[PDB]
Amino acid sequence: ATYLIGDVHGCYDELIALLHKVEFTPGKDTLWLTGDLVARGPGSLDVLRYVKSLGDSVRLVLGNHDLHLLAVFAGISRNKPKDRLTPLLEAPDADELLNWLRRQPLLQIDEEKKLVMAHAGITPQWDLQTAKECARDVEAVLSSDSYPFFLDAMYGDMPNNWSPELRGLGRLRFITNAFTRMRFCFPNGQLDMYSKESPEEAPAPLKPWFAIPGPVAEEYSIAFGHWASLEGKGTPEGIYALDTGCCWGGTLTCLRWEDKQYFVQPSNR
Ligand SMILES: [Mn+2]
Ligand SMILES: [Mn+2]
């Protein structure tokens, strides 16, 4: 069976309880994770140890808190007490876990399932070929020896409009924001980097990225996490918002692909 779970955010106990509920069995089953494996919850260290141990039985995409963790590790960004990352950063296997983390994809595609996964979704300004090229470009910088330079360059809210003519720092920053921070779009598909509210509470003319017809979403199902205030609700057919805010006292959600059956684990917070 194929299981898809939203943002774990260090909620190790809930993750294991949910996987036990569905009898997740490596070798028989595959797990997809929407990223943001770490921060806020208490068990980022155990989460990374477990997910890394799953090997080919897990298909992960990186989220914005995963990238921030890598930025802290690399000395680029300051550790925020509320993220609760110190046990992981101080762990003796921190290097092994974080060097594995930075080699993971931004984008997962399964053609037989016609299924796409990224942390925040697929901007309607991208077709599938472009999304693939952009993921490959940022994965290449993240997996390279020079990744701290990229991580430093990633921060920024501009440019917020895609063009194949984008070059250099602006190009990387857009790609990063689109894959890992996107929620709302302007009518022309340009990213808004400020509103984190639910679609009903957002100011006009902002609409959810998935409310704008895009070429990927017209052909593929898209699973994503990230947007907790969406509460997994309000999406079109073929769009699966899996982040139901476990670290926030919400729930951890697991979707079984074959029958589209949902399983839920209540937060322990
Ligand atoms: Mn996120
Ligand atoms: Mn998140």
From Swiss-Prot:
Belongs to the Ap4A hydrolase family. GO terms for biological process: nucleobase-containing small molecule interconversion; response to X-ray; RNA decapping. The keyword Zinc does not apply. The lineage of its organism: Bacteria, Pseudomonadati, Pseudomonadota, Gammaproteobacteria, Enterobacterales. Hydrolyzes diadenosine 5',5'''-P1,P4-tetraphosphate to yield ADP. GO terms for molecular function: bis(5'-nucleosyl)-tetraphosphatase (symmetrical) activity; bis(5'-nucleosyl)-tetraphosphatase activity; hydrolase activity; phosphatase activity. Its EC number is 3.6.1.41. GO terms for cellular component: cytoplasm. Co(2+) is a strong stimulator (100-fold increase in rate of hydrolysis). Mn(2+), Cd(2+), Ni(2+), Mg(2+) and Ca(2+) are weak stimulators; the two latter act synergistically with Co(2+). Keywords: Hydrolase. Monomer. Coiled coil: none annotated. It catalyses: P(1),P(4)-bis(5'-adenosyl) tetraphosphate + H2O = 2 ADP + 2 H(+). It comes from Escherichia coli (strain K12). PANTHER family: CYTOCHROME C5, PTHR40942. This is Bis(5'-nucleosyl)-tetraphosphatase [symmetrical]. HAMAP family: ApaH (MF_00199). Gene3D superfamilies: 3.60.21.10. The keyword Hydrolase applies.
